[model samples]
Target: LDRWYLGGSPKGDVDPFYYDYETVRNGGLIFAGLAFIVGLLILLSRRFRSGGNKKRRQINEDEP
Candidate 1:
């Protein structure tokens, strides 16, 4: 197996510590973080909107 993601020699082996030229892996972290964050944001926004509407129906009856 020739690993050339380091932008260097394909026959060279380098121990990566999240540091290198186009080397190592980070796609999984970014993907997972985005998935969690997106889902969290969507649920939070939906809850706030629906909750506020219900609260308003009970309280805002004194409005107009």
Candidate 2:
């Protein structure tokens, strides 16, 4: 039956895109905060590592 039919529920179905502002804000903030913490931890650990140097040998292309 159509949602607006007289015998249907008093309130029609809520639109899918209709989000409550406070709910969206709180949920988005939590998601972003957790993601940032994880990203920062990975970046800092990689940046401050002790094995940042390596020696490379030069190739002698002209050797007979």
Candidate 3:
């Protein structure tokens, strides 16, 4: 397989075979899920760009 023999590494780096998907599906899933959650939090709870425009005075308030 590509990871078994064709992969290269720096002398101190982790071996690709250990991280290969066939051997580490659970770890991959956890990492991917965590990334998704963090991304969602960043997107969903983000601040509004500005304090919104003030409401106009109502016609009833002006008349009464």
Q: Which candidate is the best by TM-score?
A: 3
Candidate 1 wrong stretches, greater than 4 Å: 1-24, 52-64
Report every candidate's CA lDDT: 0.62, 0.63, 0.60
Which stretches of candidate 2 lie above 4 Å from their native place? 1-22, 48-64
Worst 10 residues of 2 by lDDT: 49-58
Which pairs of residues collide in candidate 3? none
Prediction 1 global C-alpha lDDT: 0.62
The whole-model C-alpha lDDT of candidate 3 against the native structure comes to: 0.60
Candidate 3 per-residue lDDT over residues 1-64, each given as its tens digit? 4568643555666656644657475777778988988887675544343235533433454554
Ranking by lDDT: 2, 1, 3
**After best superposition, candidate 3 residue 16: deviation in angstroms?**
9.5
The CA lDDT at 13 in model 2 is 62
Question: Which model, 1 or 3, shows the larger lDDT?
Answer: 1
* C-alpha RMSD between model 1 and the true structure: 11.2
